[PDB]
Design an enzyme around this catalytic site. Structure first.
Site, PDB file in Angstrom:
ATOM      1  N   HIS A  93       0.804  -1.289   0.010  1.00  0.00           N
ATOM      2  CA  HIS A  93      -0.096  -0.125  -0.007  1.00  0.00           C
ATOM      3  C   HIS A  93       0.836   1.251   0.086  1.00  0.00           C
ATOM      4  CE1 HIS A  93       0.209   0.941   4.560  1.00  0.00           C
ATOM      5  NE2 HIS A  93      -0.140   1.873   3.978  1.00  0.00           N
ATOM      6  N   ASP A 117      -0.523  -7.202   2.190  1.00  0.00           N
ATOM      7  CA  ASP A 117       0.019  -6.172   1.980  1.00  0.00           C
ATOM      8  C   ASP A 117       1.526  -6.199   2.368  1.00  0.00           C
ATOM      9  OD1 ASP A 117       0.239  -3.438   1.839  1.00  0.00           O
ATOM     10  OD2 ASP A 117      -0.650  -3.073   4.096  1.00  0.00           O
ATOM     11  N   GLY A 144       2.361   6.850   8.478  1.00  0.00           N
ATOM     12  CA  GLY A 144       4.049   6.980   8.494  1.00  0.00           C
ATOM     13  C   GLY A 144       4.663   5.753   8.859  1.00  0.00           C
ATOM     14  N   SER A 166       4.049   2.714   8.439  1.00  0.00           N
ATOM     15  CA  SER A 166       3.528   1.304   7.470  1.00  0.00           C
ATOM     16  C   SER A 166       4.838   0.795   6.645  1.00  0.00           C
ATOM     17  CB  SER A 166       2.470   1.753   6.421  1.00  0.00           C
ATOM     18  OG  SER A 166       1.307   2.036   7.072  1.00  0.00           O
TER      19      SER A 166
HETATM   20  N1  LIG Z   1      -2.009  -0.505  13.498  1.00  0.00           N
HETATM   21  C1  LIG Z   1      -1.177  -0.182  12.523  1.00  0.00           C
HETATM   22  N2  LIG Z   1      -0.422  -1.008  12.330  1.00  0.00           N
HETATM   23  C2  LIG Z   1      -1.317   1.106  11.849  1.00  0.00           C
HETATM   24  C3  LIG Z   1      -2.073   1.942  11.528  1.00  0.00           C
HETATM   25  C4  LIG Z   1      -1.812   2.647  10.553  1.00  0.00           C
HETATM   26  C5  LIG Z   1      -2.366   3.686  10.262  1.00  0.00           C
HETATM   27  C6  LIG Z   1      -2.371   4.649   9.039  1.00  0.00           C
HETATM   28  N3  LIG Z   1      -2.887   5.786   8.572  1.00  0.00           N
HETATM   29  O1  LIG Z   1      -2.686   6.602   9.293  1.00  0.00           O
HETATM   30  O2  LIG Z   1      -3.405   5.593   7.503  1.00  0.00           O
HETATM   31  C7  LIG Z   1      -0.913   3.996   8.280  1.00  0.00           C
HETATM   32  C8  LIG Z   1      -0.738   3.060   8.792  1.00  0.00           C
HETATM   33  C9  LIG Z   1      -0.889   2.262   9.808  1.00  0.00           C
HETATM   34  N4  LIG Z   1      -0.255   1.154  10.152  1.00  0.00           N
END
Ligand SMILES: N=C(N)c1cc2cc([N+](=O)[O-])ccc2[nH]1
Length: 246
Positions: A46, A97, A196, A198
């Site tokens: 993503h 993902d 951020g 991810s």
């Molecule tokens: N709980 C996670 N593992 C996770 C929450 C999250 C949120 C966003 N976001 O703000 O879009 C991006 C990545 C994320 N990872």
């Protein structure tokens, strides 16, 4: 990372900082990743699906700070950007993902290990620690949900593994979470991954060995009650990983 603590790359020497060059030359932060062998970084699909072109991307290894250089860092271009064919975009719950970046310097070299650049081990198939196990997450992501800016210093925190049954509760995530996903959160919900973070590593100690158990993927908000972070379950994609790193 909401809560947790500041750190340096010595404490997650496999952590990869990935950026994208815009047209007109500006470079912004995309996502984290993990070095699994000298030429291969693993991340989340993503991060890249909107801009699938491998020439737009810059990877750094041995890098502690977001917008400044770390002594002894390496800079890489992406020779191959491999996305998972079965990826899906829910509203939150991205399936499959997982992504792989083949890295190579302008000099044609892969990563050279040092005090600040090392690889992380992949788990053995379908071998995950038990729920309640403490694991660490690493990233340059938001320090508060309302923040505009990303922190300049790398951060880490500790989150606990949540059973598939528990994450399946309707008042958690219901059917959004699958067996190819891992949930993890704080008992007080004080600390979490956020925007951020991810692509970055969830590393658990699994019978004597630091192991890439997960990859930061999605969550509802950050550090909200009943709303854990969700991670790609690496122990479920080893055939995918081994075939594509050839
Ligand atoms: N709980 C996670 N593992 C996770 C929450 C999250 C949120 C966003 N976001 O703000 O879009 C991006 C990545 C994320 N990872």
């Amino acid at each position: 990372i909401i809560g947790g603590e500041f750190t340096t790359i010595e404490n997650q020497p496999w952590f990869a900082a990935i950026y994208r060059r815009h047209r007109g030359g500006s470079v912004t932060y995309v996502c984290g990743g993990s070095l699994i062998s000298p030429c291969w970084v693993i991340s989340a699909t993503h991060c890249f699906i909107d801009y699938p072109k491998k020439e737009d991307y810059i990877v750094y290894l041995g890098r502690s700070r977001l917008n400044s250089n770390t002594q002894g860092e390496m800079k890489f271009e992406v020779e191959n950007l491999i996305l998972h064919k079965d990826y899906s975009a829910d509203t939150l719950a991205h399936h499959n993902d997982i992504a792989l970046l083949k890295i190579r310097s302008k000099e044609g070299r892969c990563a050279q290990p040092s005090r600040t650049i090392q690889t992380i081990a992949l788990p053995s198939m379908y071998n995950d620690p038990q729920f309640g196990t403490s694991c660490e997450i690493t990233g340059f992501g938001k320090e508060n949900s309302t923040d505009y800016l990303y922190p300049e210093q790398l951060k880490m925190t500790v989150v606990k593994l949540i059973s598939h049954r528990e994450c399946q509760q309707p008042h958690y995530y219901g059917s959004e979470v699958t067996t190819k996903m891992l949930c993890a959160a704080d008992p007080q919900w004080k600390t979490d991954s956020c925007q951020g973070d991810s692509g970055g590593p969830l590393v658990c100690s699994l019978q004597g060995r630091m192991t890439l158990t997960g990859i930061v993927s999605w969550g509802r908000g950050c550090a909200l009650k009943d709303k854990p972070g969700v991670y790609t379950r690496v122990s479920h994609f080893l055939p995918w990983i081994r075939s594509h790193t050839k």
